[PDB]
C-alpha cells in the first residue's frame, strides 16, 4: 500500500564528509516515513485531532487545503564516538536519530 509506512534509509557519514569528527559508527539505519495520509486513518498511528480535521477538509475540498504529511511520531537515539571542537574524544547520545513509528501530522 502507498499508505504512510516506514522505509529503510542508510545514513553514510563518510558520504557527507563527517569522517573528520566522527569515529564510530560511520553508518547507521535511520529509516524514513513516506506515504499517503488519507481516510481511513489507522488509530494506532495516533493521529492528532488537528490531523483528522485537515484530512476531512482535504477530503471535502482538495484545492486550497492539502493533506497531512507522513512523518515520524516516535524516535530513538544513537550514541556517537567522535572528536570535539576542543580535540577531545567523546561519546554522546544524540536524540531523535532513528524512526521507530510513523504517523500523520
Amino acid at each position: 500500500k502507498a499508505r504512510c509506512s516506514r522505509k529503510a534509509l542508510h545514513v553514510n557519514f563518510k558520504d557527507m564528509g563527517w569522517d573528520d569528527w566522527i569515529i564510530a559508527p560511520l553508518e547507521y539505519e535511520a529509516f524514513h516515513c513516506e506515504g499517503l495520509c488519507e481516510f481511513p486513518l489507522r488509530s494506532h498511528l495516533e493521529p492528532t485531532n488537528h490531523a483528522v480535521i485537515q484530512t476531512l477538509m482535504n477530503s471535502m475540498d482538495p484545492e486550497s487545503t492539502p493533506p497531512t504529511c507522513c512523518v515520524p511520531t516516535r524516535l530513538s537515539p544513537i550514541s556517537i564516538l567522535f572528536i570535539d571542537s576542543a580535540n577531545n574524544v567523546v561519546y554522546k547520545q544524540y536524540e531523535d536519530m532513528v524512526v521507530e513509528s510513523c504517523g500523520c501530522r
Binding site: 534509509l9 545514513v11 531523535d96
Partner: protein, 104 residues
C-alpha cells in the same frame, strides 16, 4: 519563500453539518502547515536531528524525500454544547490549532 510556513484554514461548522451540535463557536481557525524544508537547521524551523540528516541525504540522493512541513505546536479550543439536561456546557478539545510549524 514557498518554504515551511503556516497557512490560513477556517473550518465552518455550517459547511460540515455540525452546527446543530456545536451551538458555539460557528467555526474556528485551525490553519495548516505546508512548504519546503530545504534547510531545517534554520532556527525558525524547529527541527529534529532526524529531519536534518534526512534532508542532507536528499541533496545527494533525490530518491530520499526531504523532511515534511508539519505542525510542531498545537493549542486547544473550546466549544459550547447542550447537556443531557439542556444546560449550556463548555468542552475543551486538545491539539486543534497550529501555533508553529517545523520540519520532521
Amino acid at each position: 519563500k514557498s518554504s515551511c510556513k503556516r497557512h490560513p484554514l477556517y473550518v465552518d461548522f455550517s459547511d460540515v453539518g455540525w452546527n446543530d451540535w456545536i451551538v458555539a463557536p460557528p467555526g474556528y481557525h485551525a490553519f495548516y502547515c505546508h512548504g519546503e524544508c530545504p534547510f531545517p537547521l534554520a532556527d525558525h524551523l524547529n527541527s529534529t536531528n532526524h529531519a536534518i540528516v534526512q534532508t542532507l541525504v536528499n541533496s545527494v540522493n533525490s530518491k530520499i524525500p526531504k523532511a515534511c512541513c508539519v505542525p510542531t505546536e498545537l493549542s486547544a479550543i473550546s466549544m459550547l454544547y447542550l447537556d443531557e439536561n439542556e444546560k449550556v456546557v463548555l468542552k475543551n478539545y486538545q491539539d486543534m490549532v497550529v501555533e508553529g510549524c517545523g520540519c520532521r
